[PDB]
C-alpha cells in the first residue's frame, strides 16, 4: 500500500 496514492 502506497502512502501517497491509492491508485494501483
Amino acid at each position: 500500500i502506497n502512502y501517497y496514492t491509492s491508485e494501483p
Epitope: 500500500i1 502512502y3 501517497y4 496514492t5 491509492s6 491508485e7 494501483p8
Partner: single-chain antibody, 231 residues
C-alpha cells in the same frame, strides 16, 4: 468486522462551513486509504478525494480543491471532511469508505447535509433503468472512455448496488471478481472498455441503483447509474 460510523445529519445555511466525521473500527486505521463520495439527487455518485491516515497525505478531485478538506485523527481513529462556502449544490449525502487494495468494500452509513476534467475517465451507463419480474435474469451495461486495463494485468472496473435507503455495496471488483458476501447470482464481464453486470434469478433484495466505477486513476469516476425495479 470493519465499521465506519459517520456523524449525524446536518441542516445548514448557505455561506457557512460544516465538518463531518467518520469513526473507524475493526482494522488498522493507519494502514488503508479512506475515500469520500457525494450522493446528490440526480447526480449519482461523485468521488471527492481520499486520505491516508498514516501519512496524512490527501488527494482530491480537482472539482473539490477549495471546497473539501480531508483530515484524520489517529488518536480517535476518525476521518473528517470539512466543506466551505456551502451552497445548494452541496446538499447531498456524503459517505466515507475504506479502500481495501482498490476495493471500496466498507462504507459508512452516510451523513446527510441539507443546505437550506477533460482527461478524466468518463463512465457511461446507457440505461437509466431496468424493469424486471422476480426470477428473470438481467444484464446492465457500462462503458469507459479509456481502457481500464493496468500493466499489472488487472482491469480496474467495479460494480456497486445502492439499495433503497442504504449505502452502496460492492458487488464485483476488478471487472469479474465476486466480492465477499455477495451471492454468485451476480457476475461481471468485459472488454476493458465495455462491461456487463449479469444478475440471475432477480429477487426483491436486488432492487436499487447499480453503478459502475473506475479505480484506475484519479479522480475516481462512477457511471450515471441504472435503477433496477420490479414490474
Amino acid at each position: 468486522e470493519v465499521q465506519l460510523q459517520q456523524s449525524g445529519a446536518e441542516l445548514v445555511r448557505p455561506g457557512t462551513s460544516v465538518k463531518m466525521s467518520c469513526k473507524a473500527a475493526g482494522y488498522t486505521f493507519t494502514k488503508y486509504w479512506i475515500g469520500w463520495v457525494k450522493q446528490r439527487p440526480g447526480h449519482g455518485l461523485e468521488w471527492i478525494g481520499d486520505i491516508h491516515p498514516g501519512s496524512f497525505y490527501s488527494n482530491y478531485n480537482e472539482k473539490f480543491k477549495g471546497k473539501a478538506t480531508l483530515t484524520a485523527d489517529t488518536s480517535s481513529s476518525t476521518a473528517y471532511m470539512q466543506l466551505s462556502s456551502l451552497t445548494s449544490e452541496d446538499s447531498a449525502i456524503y459517505y466515507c469508505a475504506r479502500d481495501y487494495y482498490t476495493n471500496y468494500g466498507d462504507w459508512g452509513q452516510g451523513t446527510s447535509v441539507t443546505v437550506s476534467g477533460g482527461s478524466d475517465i468518463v463512465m457511461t451507463q446507457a440505461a437509466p433503468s431496468v424493469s424486471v419480474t422476480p426470477g428473470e435474469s438481467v444484464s446492465i451495461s457500462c462503458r469507459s472512455s479509456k481502457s481500464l486495463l493496468h500493466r499489472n494485468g488487472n482491469t480496474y472496473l467495479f460494480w456497486f448496488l445502492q439499495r433503497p435507503g442504504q449505502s452502496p455495496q460492492l458487488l464485483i471488483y476488478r471487472m469479474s471478481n465476486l466480492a465477499s458476501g455477495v451471492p454468485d447470482r451476480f457476475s461481471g464481464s468485459g472488454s476493458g472498455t465495455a462491461f456487463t453486470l449479469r444478475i440471475s434469478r432477480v429477487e426483491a433484495e436486488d432492487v436499487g441503483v447499480y453503478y459502475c466505477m473506475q479505480h484506475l486513476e484519479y479522480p475516481y469516476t462512477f457511471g450515471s447509474g441504472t435503477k433496477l425495479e420490479l414490474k
